[PDB]
mmCIF file of C-alpha atoms in Angstrom:
data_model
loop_
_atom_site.group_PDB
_atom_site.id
_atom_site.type_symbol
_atom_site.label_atom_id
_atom_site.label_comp_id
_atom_site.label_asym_id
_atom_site.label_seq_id
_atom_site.Cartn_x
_atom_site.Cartn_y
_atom_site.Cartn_z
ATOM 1 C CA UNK A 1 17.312 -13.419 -102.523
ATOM 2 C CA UNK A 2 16.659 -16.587 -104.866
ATOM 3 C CA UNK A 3 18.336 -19.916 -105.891
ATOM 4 C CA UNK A 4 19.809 -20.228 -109.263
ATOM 5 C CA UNK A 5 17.551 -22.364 -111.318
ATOM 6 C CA UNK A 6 19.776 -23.559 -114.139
ATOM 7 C CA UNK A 7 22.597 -23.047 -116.404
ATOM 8 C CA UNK A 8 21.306 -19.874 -118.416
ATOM 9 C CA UNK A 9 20.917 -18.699 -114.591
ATOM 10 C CA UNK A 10 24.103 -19.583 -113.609
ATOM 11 C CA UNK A 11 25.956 -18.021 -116.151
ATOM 12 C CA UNK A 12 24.198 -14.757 -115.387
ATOM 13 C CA UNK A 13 24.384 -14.449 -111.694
ATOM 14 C CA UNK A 14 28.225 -15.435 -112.111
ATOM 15 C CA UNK A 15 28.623 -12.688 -114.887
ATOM 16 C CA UNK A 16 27.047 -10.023 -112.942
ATOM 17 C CA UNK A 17 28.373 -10.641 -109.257
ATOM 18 C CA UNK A 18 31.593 -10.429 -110.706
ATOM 19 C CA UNK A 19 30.882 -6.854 -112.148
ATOM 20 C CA UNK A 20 30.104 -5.620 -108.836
ATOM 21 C CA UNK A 21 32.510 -7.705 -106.832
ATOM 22 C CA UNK A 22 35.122 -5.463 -109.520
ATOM 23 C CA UNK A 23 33.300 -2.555 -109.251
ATOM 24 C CA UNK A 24 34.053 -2.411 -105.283
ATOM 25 C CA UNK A 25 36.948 -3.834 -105.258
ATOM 26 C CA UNK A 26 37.740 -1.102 -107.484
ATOM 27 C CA UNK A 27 35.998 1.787 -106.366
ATOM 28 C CA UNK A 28 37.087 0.759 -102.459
ATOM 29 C CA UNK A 29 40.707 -0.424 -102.964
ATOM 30 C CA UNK A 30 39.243 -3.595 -101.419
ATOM 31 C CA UNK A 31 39.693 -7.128 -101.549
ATOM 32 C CA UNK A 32 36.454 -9.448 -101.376
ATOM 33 C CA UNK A 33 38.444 -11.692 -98.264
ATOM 34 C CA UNK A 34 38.021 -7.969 -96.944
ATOM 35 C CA UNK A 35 34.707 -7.253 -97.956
ATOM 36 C CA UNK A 36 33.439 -10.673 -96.676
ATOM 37 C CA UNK A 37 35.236 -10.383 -93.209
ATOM 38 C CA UNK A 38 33.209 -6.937 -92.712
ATOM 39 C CA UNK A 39 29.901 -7.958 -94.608
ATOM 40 C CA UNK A 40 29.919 -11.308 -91.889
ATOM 41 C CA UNK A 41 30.727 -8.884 -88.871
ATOM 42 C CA UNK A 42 27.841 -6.704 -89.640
ATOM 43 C CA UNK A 43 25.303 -9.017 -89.947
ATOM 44 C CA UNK A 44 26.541 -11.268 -86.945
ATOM 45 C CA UNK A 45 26.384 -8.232 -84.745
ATOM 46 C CA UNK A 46 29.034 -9.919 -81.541
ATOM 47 C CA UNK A 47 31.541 -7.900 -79.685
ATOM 48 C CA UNK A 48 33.503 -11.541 -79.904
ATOM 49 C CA UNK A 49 34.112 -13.952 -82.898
ATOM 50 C CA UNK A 50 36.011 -16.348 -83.800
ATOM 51 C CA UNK A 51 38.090 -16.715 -87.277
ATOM 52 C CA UNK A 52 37.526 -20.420 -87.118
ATOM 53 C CA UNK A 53 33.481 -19.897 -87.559
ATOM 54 C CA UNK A 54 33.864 -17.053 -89.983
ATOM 55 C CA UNK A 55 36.381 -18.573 -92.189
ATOM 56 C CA UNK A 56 33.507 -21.572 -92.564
ATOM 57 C CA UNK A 57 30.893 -19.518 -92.931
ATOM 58 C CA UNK A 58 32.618 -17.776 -95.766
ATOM 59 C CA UNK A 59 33.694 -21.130 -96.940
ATOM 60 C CA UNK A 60 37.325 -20.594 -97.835
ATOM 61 C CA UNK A 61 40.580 -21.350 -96.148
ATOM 62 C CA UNK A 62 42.599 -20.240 -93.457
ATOM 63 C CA UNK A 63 45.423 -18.399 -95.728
ATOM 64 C CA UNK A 64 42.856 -16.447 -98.104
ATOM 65 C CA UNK A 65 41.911 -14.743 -94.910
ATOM 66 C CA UNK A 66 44.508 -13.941 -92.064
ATOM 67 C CA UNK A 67 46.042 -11.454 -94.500
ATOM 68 C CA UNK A 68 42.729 -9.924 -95.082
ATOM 69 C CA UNK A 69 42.189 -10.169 -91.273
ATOM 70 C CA UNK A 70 46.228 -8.106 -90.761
ATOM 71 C CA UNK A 71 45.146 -5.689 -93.022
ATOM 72 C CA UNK A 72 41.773 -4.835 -91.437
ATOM 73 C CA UNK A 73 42.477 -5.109 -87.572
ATOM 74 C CA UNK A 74 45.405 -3.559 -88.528
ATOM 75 C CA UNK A 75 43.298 -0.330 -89.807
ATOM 76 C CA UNK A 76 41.510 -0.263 -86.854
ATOM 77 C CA UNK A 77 38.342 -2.060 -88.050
ATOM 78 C CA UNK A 78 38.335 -4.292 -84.883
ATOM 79 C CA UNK A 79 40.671 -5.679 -82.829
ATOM 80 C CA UNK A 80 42.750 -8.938 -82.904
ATOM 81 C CA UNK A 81 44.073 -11.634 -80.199
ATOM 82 C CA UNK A 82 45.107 -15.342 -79.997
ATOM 83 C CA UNK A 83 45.125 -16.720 -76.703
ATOM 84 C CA UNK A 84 44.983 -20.141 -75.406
ATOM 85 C CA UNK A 85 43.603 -22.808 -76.980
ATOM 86 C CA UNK A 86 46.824 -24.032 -78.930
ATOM 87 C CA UNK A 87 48.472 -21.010 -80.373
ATOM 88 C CA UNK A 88 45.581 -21.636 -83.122
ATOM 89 C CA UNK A 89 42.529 -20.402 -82.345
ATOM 90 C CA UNK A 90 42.467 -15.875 -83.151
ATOM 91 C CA UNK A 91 39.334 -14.202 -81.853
ATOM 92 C CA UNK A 92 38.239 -10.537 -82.920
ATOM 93 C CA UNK A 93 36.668 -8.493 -81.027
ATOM 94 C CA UNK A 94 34.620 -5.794 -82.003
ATOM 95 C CA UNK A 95 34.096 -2.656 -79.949
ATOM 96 C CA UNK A 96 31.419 -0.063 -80.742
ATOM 97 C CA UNK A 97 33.118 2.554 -82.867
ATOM 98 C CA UNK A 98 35.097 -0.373 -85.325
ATOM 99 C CA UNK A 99 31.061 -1.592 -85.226
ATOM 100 C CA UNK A 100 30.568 1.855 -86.335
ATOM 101 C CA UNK A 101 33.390 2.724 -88.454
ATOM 102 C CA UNK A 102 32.840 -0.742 -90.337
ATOM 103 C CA UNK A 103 28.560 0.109 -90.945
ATOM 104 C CA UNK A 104 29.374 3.234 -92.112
ATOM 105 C CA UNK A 105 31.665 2.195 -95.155
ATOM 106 C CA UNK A 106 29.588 -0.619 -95.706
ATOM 107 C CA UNK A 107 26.707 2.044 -96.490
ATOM 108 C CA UNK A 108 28.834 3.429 -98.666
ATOM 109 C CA UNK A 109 28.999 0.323 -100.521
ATOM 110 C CA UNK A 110 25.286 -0.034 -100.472
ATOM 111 C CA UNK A 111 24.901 3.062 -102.091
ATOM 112 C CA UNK A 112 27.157 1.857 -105.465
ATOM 113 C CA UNK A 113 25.505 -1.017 -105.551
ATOM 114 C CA UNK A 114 21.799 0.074 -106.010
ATOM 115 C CA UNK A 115 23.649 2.680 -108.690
ATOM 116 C CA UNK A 116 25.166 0.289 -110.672
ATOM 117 C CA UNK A 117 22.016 -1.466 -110.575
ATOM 118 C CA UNK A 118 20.651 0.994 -113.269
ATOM 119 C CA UNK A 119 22.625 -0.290 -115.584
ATOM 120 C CA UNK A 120 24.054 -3.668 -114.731
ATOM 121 C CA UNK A 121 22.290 -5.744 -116.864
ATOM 122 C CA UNK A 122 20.417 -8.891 -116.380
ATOM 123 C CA UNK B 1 14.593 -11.502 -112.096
ATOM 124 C CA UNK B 2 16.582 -10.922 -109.344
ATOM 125 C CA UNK B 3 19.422 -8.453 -108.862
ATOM 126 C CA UNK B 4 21.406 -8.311 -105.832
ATOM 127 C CA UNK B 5 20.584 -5.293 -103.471
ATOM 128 C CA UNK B 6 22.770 -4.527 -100.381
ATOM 129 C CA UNK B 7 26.273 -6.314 -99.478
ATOM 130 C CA UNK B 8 24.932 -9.137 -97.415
ATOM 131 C CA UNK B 9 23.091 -10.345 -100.772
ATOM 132 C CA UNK B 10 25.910 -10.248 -102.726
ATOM 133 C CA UNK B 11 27.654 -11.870 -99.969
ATOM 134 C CA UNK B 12 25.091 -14.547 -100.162
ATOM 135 C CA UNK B 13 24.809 -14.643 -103.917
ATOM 136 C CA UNK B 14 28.553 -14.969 -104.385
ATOM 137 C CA UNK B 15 29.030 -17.989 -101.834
ATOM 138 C CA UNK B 16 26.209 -19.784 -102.876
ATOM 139 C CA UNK B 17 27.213 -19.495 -106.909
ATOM 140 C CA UNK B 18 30.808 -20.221 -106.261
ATOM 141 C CA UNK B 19 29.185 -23.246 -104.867
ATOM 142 C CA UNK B 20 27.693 -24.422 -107.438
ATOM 143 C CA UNK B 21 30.573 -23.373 -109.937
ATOM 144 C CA UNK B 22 33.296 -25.706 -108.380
ATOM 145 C CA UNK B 23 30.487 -28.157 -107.612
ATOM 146 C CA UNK B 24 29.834 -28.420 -111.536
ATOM 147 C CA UNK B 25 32.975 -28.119 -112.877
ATOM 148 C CA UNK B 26 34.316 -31.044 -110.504
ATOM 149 C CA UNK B 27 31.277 -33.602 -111.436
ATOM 150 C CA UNK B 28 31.917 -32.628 -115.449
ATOM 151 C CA UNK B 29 35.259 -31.886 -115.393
ATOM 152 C CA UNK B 30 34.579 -28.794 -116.863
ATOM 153 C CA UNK B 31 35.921 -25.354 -116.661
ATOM 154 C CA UNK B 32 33.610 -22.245 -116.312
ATOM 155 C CA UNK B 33 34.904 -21.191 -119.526
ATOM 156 C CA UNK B 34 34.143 -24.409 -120.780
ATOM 157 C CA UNK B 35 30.483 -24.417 -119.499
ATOM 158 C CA UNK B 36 30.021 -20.232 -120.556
ATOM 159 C CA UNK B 37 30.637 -21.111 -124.270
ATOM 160 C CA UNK B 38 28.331 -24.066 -124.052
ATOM 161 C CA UNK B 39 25.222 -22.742 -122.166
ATOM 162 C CA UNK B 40 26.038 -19.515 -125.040
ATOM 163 C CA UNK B 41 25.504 -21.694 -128.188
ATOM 164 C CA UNK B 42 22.582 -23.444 -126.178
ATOM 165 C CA UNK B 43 20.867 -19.868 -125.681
ATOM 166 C CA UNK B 44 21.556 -18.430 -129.068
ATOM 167 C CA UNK B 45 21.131 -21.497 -131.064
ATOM 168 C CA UNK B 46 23.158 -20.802 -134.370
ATOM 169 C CA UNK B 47 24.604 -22.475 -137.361
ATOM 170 C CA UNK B 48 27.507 -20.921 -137.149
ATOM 171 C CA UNK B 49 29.651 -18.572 -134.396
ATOM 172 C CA UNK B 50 32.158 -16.241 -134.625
ATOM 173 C CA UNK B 51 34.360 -16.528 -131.773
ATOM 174 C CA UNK B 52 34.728 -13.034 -131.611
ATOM 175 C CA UNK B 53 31.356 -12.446 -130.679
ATOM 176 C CA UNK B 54 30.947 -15.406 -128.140
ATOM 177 C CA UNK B 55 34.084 -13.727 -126.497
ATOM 178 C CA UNK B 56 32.272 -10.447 -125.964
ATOM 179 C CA UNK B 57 28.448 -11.869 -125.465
ATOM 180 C CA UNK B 58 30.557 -13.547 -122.218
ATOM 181 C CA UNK B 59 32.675 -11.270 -120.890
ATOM 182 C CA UNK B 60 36.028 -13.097 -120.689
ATOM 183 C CA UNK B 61 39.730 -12.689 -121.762
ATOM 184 C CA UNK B 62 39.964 -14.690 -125.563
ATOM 185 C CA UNK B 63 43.055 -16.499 -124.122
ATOM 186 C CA UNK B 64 40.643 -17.743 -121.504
ATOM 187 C CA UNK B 65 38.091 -18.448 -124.435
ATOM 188 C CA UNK B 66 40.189 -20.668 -127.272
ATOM 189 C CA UNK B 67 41.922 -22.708 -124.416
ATOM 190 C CA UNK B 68 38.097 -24.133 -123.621
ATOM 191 C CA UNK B 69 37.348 -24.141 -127.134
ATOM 192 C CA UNK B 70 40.356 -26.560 -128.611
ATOM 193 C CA UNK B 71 39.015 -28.770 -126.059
ATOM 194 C CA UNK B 72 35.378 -28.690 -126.744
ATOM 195 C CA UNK B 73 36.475 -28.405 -130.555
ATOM 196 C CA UNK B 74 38.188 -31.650 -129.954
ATOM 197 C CA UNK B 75 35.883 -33.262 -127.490
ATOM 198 C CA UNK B 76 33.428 -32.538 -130.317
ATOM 199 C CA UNK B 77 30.664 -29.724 -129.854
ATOM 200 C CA UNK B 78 31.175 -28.040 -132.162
ATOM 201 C CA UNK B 79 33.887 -27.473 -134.984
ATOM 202 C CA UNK B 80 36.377 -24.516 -135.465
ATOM 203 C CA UNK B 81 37.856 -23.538 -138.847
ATOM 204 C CA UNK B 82 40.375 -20.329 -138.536
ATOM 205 C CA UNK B 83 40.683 -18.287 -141.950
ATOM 206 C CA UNK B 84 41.640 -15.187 -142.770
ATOM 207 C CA UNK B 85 45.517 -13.888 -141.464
ATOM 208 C CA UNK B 86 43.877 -17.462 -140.384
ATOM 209 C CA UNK B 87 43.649 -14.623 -137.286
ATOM 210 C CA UNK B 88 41.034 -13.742 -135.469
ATOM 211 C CA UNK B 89 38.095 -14.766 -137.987
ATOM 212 C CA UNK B 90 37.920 -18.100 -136.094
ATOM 213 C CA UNK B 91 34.381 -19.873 -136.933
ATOM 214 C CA UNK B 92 32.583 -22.218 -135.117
ATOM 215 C CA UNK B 93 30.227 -25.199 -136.184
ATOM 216 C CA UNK B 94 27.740 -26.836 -134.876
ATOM 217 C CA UNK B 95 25.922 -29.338 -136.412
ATOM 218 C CA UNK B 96 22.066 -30.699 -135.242
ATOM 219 C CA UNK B 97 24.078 -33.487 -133.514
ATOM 220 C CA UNK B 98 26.747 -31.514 -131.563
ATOM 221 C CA UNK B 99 23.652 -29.576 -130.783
ATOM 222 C CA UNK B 100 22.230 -32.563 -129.183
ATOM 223 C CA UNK B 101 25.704 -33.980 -127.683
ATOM 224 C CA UNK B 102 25.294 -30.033 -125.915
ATOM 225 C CA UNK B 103 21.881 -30.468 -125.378
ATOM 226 C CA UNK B 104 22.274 -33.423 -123.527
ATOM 227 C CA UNK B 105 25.347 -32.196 -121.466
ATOM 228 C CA UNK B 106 23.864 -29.284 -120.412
ATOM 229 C CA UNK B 107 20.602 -30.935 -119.631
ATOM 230 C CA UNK B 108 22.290 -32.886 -117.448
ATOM 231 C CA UNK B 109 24.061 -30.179 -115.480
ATOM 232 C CA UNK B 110 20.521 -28.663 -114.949
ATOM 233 C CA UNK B 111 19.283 -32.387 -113.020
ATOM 234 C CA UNK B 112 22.672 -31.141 -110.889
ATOM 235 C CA UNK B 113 22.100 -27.759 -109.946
ATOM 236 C CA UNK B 114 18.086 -28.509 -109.038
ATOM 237 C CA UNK B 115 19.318 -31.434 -106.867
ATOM 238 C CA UNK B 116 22.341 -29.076 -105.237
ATOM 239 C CA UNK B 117 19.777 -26.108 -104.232
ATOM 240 C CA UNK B 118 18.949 -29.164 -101.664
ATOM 241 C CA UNK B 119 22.242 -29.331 -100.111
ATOM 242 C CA UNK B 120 22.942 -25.851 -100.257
ATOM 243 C CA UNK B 121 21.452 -22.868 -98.324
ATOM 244 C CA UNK B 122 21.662 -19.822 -100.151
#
């Protein structure tokens, strides 16, 4: 929604986005590599992307993610390859029922979130 | 103002902050811990603080706590004085010109964060 204006700001945001990145993490047995990985996918609806575009996105750094990315292809979420250029690049695609399977418990995270809401303070 | 509603804002939210976290404590040299205490005493602005509190009012871990307070307590923004099993019953002083040496620190971090929500998209 809205930029962070200043340090009373700051401190609040950071205090409550770590309640609910907890709060999932928790109540999904999920990490937030994981959580991101899915959360991009969903909203950059592709049948093809690349790791190299969602690890920037994301902003962190190859190792943080691969695990998170063997863990989730590895659960079916969508599926994983690496061929070509340089042994490097890993593409994942996404068919229509890992598109499916990952929306779904994504609403189910939506639905904690506006909960929590009621009484995660300011 | 603001609370986060579905997993694509907290997505957002929680890149953009971390953003601004590493970008701040890497200009100031600070630690988050560091900067929670200070914006704290800048919000409630008291005579006197028991750490205690502080350490709830956050949300932190007290080891996490004391470590940036010996260093603020030394780098002088306050004072602490320990006394009763000289345990937990730590206080902490801050005089008008520690409040200004604060003051002054955090007002500066605030120039920062208006000038990064120019270089960042959210």
């Amino acid at each position: 929604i809205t930029k962070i204006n200043d340090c009373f700001e700051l401190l609040s945001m950071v205090t409550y986005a770590d309640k609910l990145k907890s709060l999932i993490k928790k109540e999904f047995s999920i990490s937030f590599e994981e959580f991101a990985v899915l959360t991009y996918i969903s909203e950059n609806k592709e049948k093809e992307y690349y790791f190299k575009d969602i690890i920037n996105h994301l902003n962190y750094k190859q190792p943080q993610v691969v695990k998170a990315v063997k863990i989730l292809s590895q659960e079916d979420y969508f599926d994983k390859k690496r061929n070509e250029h340089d042994e490097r690049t890993v593409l994942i695609l996404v068919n229509a029922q890992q598109r499916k399977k990952i929306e779904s418990l994504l609403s189910r995270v939506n639905k904690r979130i506006t909960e929590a809401n009621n009484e995660i303070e300011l």
